[PDB]
Each structure stands twice: as C-alpha cells, then as structure tokens.
Structure 1
Amino acid sequence: TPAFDKPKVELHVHLDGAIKPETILYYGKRRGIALPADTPEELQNIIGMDKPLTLPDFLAKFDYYMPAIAGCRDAIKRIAYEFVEMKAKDGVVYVEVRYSPHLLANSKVEPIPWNQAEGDLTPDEVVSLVNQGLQEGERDFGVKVRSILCCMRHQPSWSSEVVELCKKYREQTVVAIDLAGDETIEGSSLFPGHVQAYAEAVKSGVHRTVHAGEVGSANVVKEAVDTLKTERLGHGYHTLEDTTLYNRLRQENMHFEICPWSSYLTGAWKPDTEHAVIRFKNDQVNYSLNTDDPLIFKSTLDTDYQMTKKDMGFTEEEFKRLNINAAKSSFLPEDEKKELLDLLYKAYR
C-alpha cells in the first residue's frame, strides 16, 4: 500500500491536531465535558473534515475537543506519548512536533482558552509534561522527536513567554520557535511582541520557523524572512506570487515545509490549479512533506505521499531527496544531523 516504504523525516505537525479520537472520548467522559459523540468513529466524522471549510468552521473543530485535554496533566503527557506511537506507524525516524503551550493551559494565561474554568496548569509545566511524554515515546517506539513552540498571531503578549520557554527547555526537547494562527490579521508579523520574541531567538540561538504564505500574500513571507529572520517557512505557497522573492529564496536554499493534503482542505490551494509543490519539484526547491493535522484532516503521512504520487506524478527519487532535504533542514545540532543523514543514506540505498 504505502507510497514510500523507507524511513521518513517530518518537520511540520501540530500536536493539538494529532490526538486519537478514542482518547478524547476517554477524557470527555472522565472529566465531564462530553463531546457531540461517544464513539470513536463518529467522533472522527464530525471532528474531522473531508472537504474545504472556512476558518470559523475550522476553529470550532478545536472547540469540540480541546476542553477535554487542556488543563488535565495526564492528558497532556499521554497525547505527547501517543503522538510518537502514531508516528512510528508512519515510518518516521525523525520528527519535529509543534504546539502552543498556552492553549493547553488553564492558568497563568489571559484569556483562558476554550472558555474553561481556572485551575492550576500553567504553560511552563505544559511544556515539561509534553516533553516527558515525548521522551518516553522516543524510548519505547524508537522515533527521534524534538519540539517547536508556537507563538500565536492574535496574541503578541504570549510571545516573550514562548521564547523564554524555548531557552529554559532547550535541546530537551525544544529546538525552535514558531508563529501560528491566522496570518491574515493585518500587520501581525510586525506586532512588537512577535518581533522582539524573534529577536530574542536570534540573540540566544533558538531556531526559527514561521507559518507565512499558506493563506496570505507574499508580503507576509517577506516579513517572516526579513524581519523575523526565519530559517524556514511553514507552507510558503504564495512566494510564487512574487518572483524576485521566490528566486531569492531559491538562492538562499530556504526550506519550505509543504503540507499537500492540508492545503486542499484549508482552501489555500484550489484543485483546478498548479499545485505549488510540483513547481517546487521542477525547480528543485528545498522542501518537505508533512501532515499538519492528522486528526482534523483524517490522514496519515501516507495520505500526503499518496496524493503527490497519484495526482502529481511524484517519483521515488524525489521522495528521497525531499526527506534528505528535510534532514539537512532539521533543527538538530550538527553531529546529530550527520547521524540522521547517514541512517538515511543507507536506508535509501
């Protein structure tokens, strides 16, 4: 069945979008919340999309399940644990996983997300709990995991906390800072809370990625590159819109975190068009293949590989260079990055 039967690298996946239905129900019941279902299968049917939707439509998906995990400590550790399990089934030898700590928390955060009564779970120990779950998963399932911590567009006040959390927990497991959630809010790349967070990340050596370009213009890409100093782009589809920018990113060997299946389901790509990744294939761009939200998009990594092999004529050779590009563009220290490279060179021959 699987389009690509070798080990794989993945750089772009959200933890809060990669929970098993079954364990949301488990915590729905056991805490009180009660979902719009009580069977795993129907749960995935309504909390999981299969044709494009608007943003409010999208966000209410989170409004369903997040109150069931956020706040509960053992929930937070278990989803980090089960994320590694899920990934071992995908054949991934190395993954970076991202999330917003604040969104899993029910105290020391204004506003309190998900409506949610107060309590005592702060952002700081959310990240310790996640990174316990993750370290255990690594040990039991033999996938290597690191994590990225997301800033949120609409909430520049969280952002100095995020860089500080990145520093406190560096190497183990957290390797980078991200910026997520609605790149359409005007001027959001340039909100002072975000820019000074990213400037702190330069100063102290935390690695940087930015979501720019999925649903927004090439201008928001440009700000991510020139003002936020990204090392990578999540998505970056719209840099095509601006050809000098595109060419520049080609020379600098910028890495696009591509999420094929997602981009259909979000509206970012319309089916009757050039998919941006085929252009990236033809141009020999430094890009990767990623799942984004396997919960919400009813998908595994093989969904993404499959789609590009069926409908876009991707071949096995391109699959290889892409995962190599992803290993090179990882936020691993260089010794550990050479080790990963070596594993992959052998596996691939």
Structure 2
Amino acid sequence: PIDFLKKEELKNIDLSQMSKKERYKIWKRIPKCELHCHLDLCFSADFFVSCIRKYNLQPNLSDEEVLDYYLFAKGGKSLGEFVEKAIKVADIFHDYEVIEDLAKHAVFNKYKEGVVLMEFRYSPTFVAFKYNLDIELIHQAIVKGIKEVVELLDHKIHVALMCIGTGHEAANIKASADFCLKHKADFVGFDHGGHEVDLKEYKEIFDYVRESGVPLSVHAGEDVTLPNLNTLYSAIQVLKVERIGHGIRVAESQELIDMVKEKNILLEVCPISNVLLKNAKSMDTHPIRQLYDAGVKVSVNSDDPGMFLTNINDDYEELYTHLNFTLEDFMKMNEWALEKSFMDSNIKDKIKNLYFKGEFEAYV
C-alpha cells in the first residue's frame, strides 16, 4: 500500500537532493486526483505494439516505426495533426476484448502511479467508427474492465467515467449526449473533444445534459491556432461548465482570468500534452505558472498517456523541473481537483479523510 504523503509531512522532504528516480518515488506518493485522462488513449507502448501485431496491422514496420507512425511521443504540428493521428490509432479498436483489456490495464497503471481518484473519459462514437462497433457493448466492456480491477484492488482507487462528444455535427453530439444520459448511472460528466469548435451553437444540447443533472467540462482554450478566444467565452457563459479541459489560453486575457476565478471554475491542465501539440512553446513557458500565480484553480492531468508514452507522474516531474512548483503546490492542486470532481460527495468525503486531512503548518 503506497505510503501517501501527508500535508503535515511535506516540509520534511528535500527534493533538491534527490535523483530523478527518487523524485518519481515522491511523485508516486502524492495522493493524486486526476480529472482529464482519455481512457481510449491511455496505454503503454508495449500494449499498443501488441495490439498492432495481434491484428497484423503493420507487417512492414518495426516496433519503432509503428510508434512513430501512430503516436505523438516526439510531438507534432498541432491539435489538428493530433486529431489526424487519433483517427489512425483507431486501427486498434478491432473488437470488444481489446477494449476491455485496455480498460483493465489503464486502471491498473493509474493505481500503481498513486492516483486515488480518477475520472476517465472516452468517446463512444469515436471508439466505434473504425469497425462499426456497437456503443452499448463498448461501454459494457469498459465498465466491466474497470469494475473488475477496482474490485480486485479493494476500492483503493476510485474511478468514474465521463462521456465525450466529438466533432462538429449536431447529430453526433446529440447522439453522445443521449448516450451519456441513458447511461447516467455510469457517467458523471459530459465533454466535447476533437477539433476545437465554438460550442455555443449546440447550447440546447448541453443545456439538456446539464439540466438533467450531468455537469459539463468541455475542451476549450487549448488550440493556440484559433484566431480568437470565442470557444472560452462560449464554454463559460453559454455552456456554464464547472471545469474546462485545458483552458490555458485563459492566460491571454485578463477578462477571462477574472471570469474563471469569479465563477470558481477549475482548469484541467495537461502540461505535456500542450507542449507536444505545440500549444505551449516549451514547458518553461507553459501558462500554468502564470495562471496558478494569478489565483486560478488548476489541476494536473496526463490527457493521453498512450499518445505521449507518458504517465501522470511525468507531468509532475516537468512542472517541478521546469517551473519550480513545490510539493505544497501539488497537494493544493490535488485537493482542488478533489473538491471539483464530479464523483459522489460520499466518495469525495472518504478521499478527503483518507488523504487530505491535515494542514501544512502547525497551529501557532
């Protein structure tokens, strides 16, 4: 059982005297609450390469060329290109067995990384398109795979699901919204991913989801190539989201920074994703430092461990190494993520008690 760091204990840890390996041991011991991780793009290199071989998908490529062709581990051009490679990766959604395996593995690896609260998200209609799978059996496979691992683990990690709509056709977004609500019992939130579009047009679809009791967190303010910040205004003012996926472009506008703070919105920051997709110049210039210092609530997230060949503790390493975040900062961020989690209040209460009970400093 991971020896999770406690709030009152952090002042005794000297990270400056540690090797990279020893720091990773400390990142593992942070009780992490992760809000933004696409389960359908969450795997290791090994898992991915097996899948490709299992279905004889690339007989002309070495393992290394398969990783290069399909994934984004060295970074790319833009979110646009990222969306194009995701489409390619859908080569592996061959059947429901591989899907269930994917879900077991993803949860197991989060557990070993020291995540205690995990909101996974996935896009059913996406996962279905390549082989025209049935979204109902896709969901059953994922829920089954998750339940089995959580049970095996004695509920040591708490997992919830969010449903993502993708694309810019009302028909597909509506079909996802209906699926999400049909499966309200499993889904705790509703998202939009894919190319970044202004969601204001789909107001009535999102209203209906939000008003049926499923809160919203949509991808917005990620893609630096958009000619304005309209997508952020829409998510906040029209969709009335509780959280924003990425939202890093909020840093470009004092008006938006004030809006997010005043509305108590949390930004689900994905540091490595933004650098690899060219939405931040380098980790040294990542807006999370500005936003955190401006008093915006932000949490740390991996986004797509499979596309980047990373895990959540790599994001912590980069933030510590490039931007000088501290263990205190990390604990504060995870407690914000805990408070803004869409999971049941009973579960959040348990987690608070288990991991976030003390205070950083003694009463004086």
Give the aligned partner of residue 110 of structure 1. Answer: none
Q: Judge conservation of contact 1:7–1:347 (CA < 8 Å) in 2.
A: no
Deviations 1:226-262 (A, max 9, x none): 1112111011111222212211211221100001111
Does residue 1:232 correspond to 2:243, yes or no? Answer: yes
| Alignment RMSD | 2.3
Could you say what secondary structure the match of 2:37 adopts?
coil
Q: Please list, as runs of the form range in 1=range in 2, the aligned pairs for 1:138-177 lying within 5 A after superposition.
A: 138-141=150-153, 142-172=156-186, 174-177=187-190
CA distance 1:35–1:164, change in 2 (3 Å) = farther
Q: Does 1:189 align with 2:212?
A: no
Alpha-carbon deviation of 1:150? Answer: 0.6
Structure 2 unmatched ranges of 5 or more: 1-20
* Counterparts of residues 1-349 of structure 1 (less than 5 Å): 1=21, 2=24, 3-4=26-27, 5-34=29-58, 37=61, 39=63, 43-46=66-69, 47-55=71-79, 57-69=81-93, 71-105=94-128, 113-114=129-130, 116=131, 118=132, 121-141=133-153, 142-172=156-186, 174-183=187-196, 185=197, 188-191=198-201, 194-215=202-223, 216=226, 217-271=228-282, 274-346=285-357
TM-score of the superposed pair, with normalisation by structure 1: 0.87
For 2:268, what is the secondary structure of its paired residue?
Answer: strand
- Indicate the structure with greater helix content: 2
Distance 1:330 1:243, change over 3 A: same
Distance 1:272 1:128, change over 3 A: closer
Q: Deviations over 1:58-93 (max 9, x none)?
A: 344334432222x40111111111110111121101
| Larger RCO, structures 1/2 (Cα 8 Å, 6+ apart) | 2
Equivalent residue for 2:12? none
Q: Quick one: percent identity of the two aligned structures?
A: 26
In 2, Cα distance between equivalents of 1:132 and 1:346: 32
Shift of 1:273: 6.8
**Helix, strand or coil at the partner of 1:12:** strand
Unaligned runs of 5+ in 1: 106-112
Task: Sort the Cα spacing of 1:36 and 1:281 in 2 relative to 1 into closer, same or farther, 3 A.
Answer: farther
Scaled by the length of structure 2, what TM-score is found?
0.84
